[PDB]
Design an enzyme around this catalytic site. Structure first.
Site, PDB file in Angstrom:
ATOM      1  CD1 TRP A   1      11.287 -10.422 -58.026  1.00 45.82           C
ATOM      2  CD2 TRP A   1      10.950 -10.726 -60.113  1.00 45.82           C
ATOM      3  NE1 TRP A   1       9.850  -9.802 -57.704  1.00 45.82           N
ATOM      4  CE2 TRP A   1       9.962 -10.577 -59.478  1.00 45.82           C
ATOM      5  CE3 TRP A   1      11.034 -10.601 -61.097  1.00 45.82           C
ATOM      6  CZ2 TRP A   1       8.305  -9.309 -60.191  1.00 45.82           C
ATOM      7  CZ3 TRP A   1       9.979 -10.504 -62.362  1.00 45.82           C
ATOM      8  CH2 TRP A   1       8.384  -9.676 -61.729  1.00 45.82           C
TER       9      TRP A   1
ATOM     10  CG  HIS B   1       6.214 -24.445 -58.191  1.00 47.98           C
ATOM     11  ND1 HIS B   1       7.627 -24.288 -59.198  1.00 47.98           N
ATOM     12  CD2 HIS B   1       6.660 -24.382 -56.950  1.00 47.98           C
ATOM     13  CE1 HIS B   1       8.448 -23.943 -58.457  1.00 47.98           C
ATOM     14  NE2 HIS B   1       8.235 -23.912 -57.445  1.00 47.98           N
TER      15      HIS B   1
ATOM     16  CD  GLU C   1      14.237 -11.418 -50.790  1.00 50.57           C
ATOM     17  OE1 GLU C   1      14.678 -10.215 -50.867  1.00 50.57           O
ATOM     18  OE2 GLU C   1      13.749 -11.670 -50.251  1.00 50.57           O
TER      19      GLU C   1
ATOM     20  CG  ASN D   1       6.849 -26.486 -54.287  1.00 44.86           C
ATOM     21  OD1 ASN D   1       6.289 -27.217 -54.627  1.00 44.86           O
ATOM     22  ND2 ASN D   1       6.917 -25.298 -54.298  1.00 44.86           N
TER      23      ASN D   1
ATOM     24  CG  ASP E   1      11.613 -24.618 -47.810  1.00 46.67           C
ATOM     25  OD1 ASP E   1      10.285 -25.115 -47.301  1.00 46.67           O
ATOM     26  OD2 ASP E   1      12.440 -24.763 -47.733  1.00 46.67           O
TER      27      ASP E   1
ATOM     28  NE  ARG F   1      12.484 -23.161 -45.808  1.00 50.57           N
ATOM     29  CZ  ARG F   1      13.228 -21.634 -46.262  1.00 50.57           C
ATOM     30  NH1 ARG F   1      13.730 -20.762 -44.805  1.00 50.57           N
ATOM     31  NH2 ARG F   1      13.823 -21.775 -47.047  1.00 50.57           N
TER      32      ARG F   1
ATOM     33  CG  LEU G   1      -7.642 -19.884 -42.336  1.00 45.03           C
ATOM     34  CD1 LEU G   1      -6.939 -19.813 -41.565  1.00 45.03           C
ATOM     35  CD2 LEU G   1      -7.774 -21.230 -43.755  1.00 45.03           C
TER      36      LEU G   1
END
Lengths: 232, 238
Positions: free
Chosen positions: A68, A36, A66, A21, A19, A187, A130
């Protein structure tokens, strides 16, 4: 250079909400789209960081159920962009031994986005260095509801008794049941919340809140979060 | 005196994990059990704080099914103690307009604990000032699994189609579906985790991690957490 941690204290599964961007591009007078674009290199740098430290599972929240609620233009951009990232990077991912596992619903995604994700999964399914759980059109509640629906279908078909529906039964119907619990939930930004990300899987996770906006996030921030995790 | 916040910025539902009872008793050379005893008054002070501020829903993680750090003796004590708290306080809760709702499983929990919880629910069922979701023998995963089980039973009996199960369908089978989403999730101590508490309900909750050991937690710490909440930028993915 990656930090020297004992194997016992290296998280098996790190989940990252990518988060800030938009906020990052505003602070630099750049369009939101460029945040982005900058976020793409953050992700591949963090993937390198996980490979070097030996974290076997990384989950990345690329596109929320969410999202959208955002503007038509930002949704159109985020669809095209997540598609173009996977197309441009799939060779590198295949070569570095990254297994791409798409978590989410096909829903109203463009067919071209579903196709790229599905092909990237097929291409990389034999990799073991990975596991990247790439969460596109993903929600934690949606995953649990889809698990309950699939369990419900097995009950209706008589493959499963309703009197033996337990936490281990429901866990078998998650999108990728072979991926273990989240150990460390990062976060990137100062926002202190799960935002509906790997809800079942994060029940016992350590939360690390950094102040770094995602485009400024790289392997050193990832390594720092793993260091905080080890001292806990 | 409670802080002056606009109604829009007061959390509708606050959830609290009440940890640091042990560490608090150790700092005072008392047994860990006495920190839990001291924690009782913290909870009733926070309930008063919620009543004064007008928070309509409070959830308290009183007893987790999983107590893996805890000694057998402390688990035995915490079962008896959560029973004795609810028995001794139910009249006060009734008088203050608090509706008690027990969230959790009958499981291995003693009959005496279930009885006190069930009677407190019956006594307070017409109250509307504050809903106290008292989570005893509770786990977030266990609640979701019990929701899926109850949904499964409706499917087996042919009361429900398996093919149209959505988030809203599953949400109807949670322990108390009338209790809304958690807005604010408070962890009293410095420990930064959910510890398997109101998992479905906390999906978009604001987390506030305070450093206060639970026996030192009172309405002012609760009010501080609500003040931190009132400054948060809630987006829900928008």
């Amino acid at each position: 250079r990656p930090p020297q941690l004992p194997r016992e204290l290296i998280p098996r599964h790190v989940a990252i909400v990518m988060d800030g961007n938009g906020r990052w591009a505003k602070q630099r007078g750049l369009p939101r789209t460029e945040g982005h674009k900058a976020g793409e290199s953050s992700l591949f740098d963090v993937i390198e960081g996980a490979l070097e430290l030996g974290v076997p599972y990384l989950s990345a929240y690329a596109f929320s159920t969410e999202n959208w609620k955002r503007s038509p233009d930002e949704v159109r951009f985020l669809m095209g962009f997540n598609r173009d990232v996977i197309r441009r990077r799939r060779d590198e991912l295949h070569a570095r031994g990254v297994r791409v596992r798409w978590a989410g619903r096909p829903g109203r995604l463009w067919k071209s986005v579903i196709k790229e994700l599905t092909e990237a999964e097929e291409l990389t399914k034999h990799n073991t260095k990975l596991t990247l759980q790439f969460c596109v059109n993903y929600g934690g509640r949606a995953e649990i509801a889809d698990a309950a629906a699939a369990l419900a279908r097995d009950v209706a078909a008589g493959r499963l008794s309703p009197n033996r529906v337990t936490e281990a039964t429901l866990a078998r119907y998650l999108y990728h049941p072979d991926i273990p619990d989240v150990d460390l939930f990062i976060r990137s930004s100062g926002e202190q919340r799960l935002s509906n990300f790997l809800l079942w899987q994060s029940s016992y996770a350590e939360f690390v809140f950094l102040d770094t906006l995602w485009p400024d996030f790289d392997r050193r921030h990832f390594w720092q979060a793993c260091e905080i995790y080890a001292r806990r």
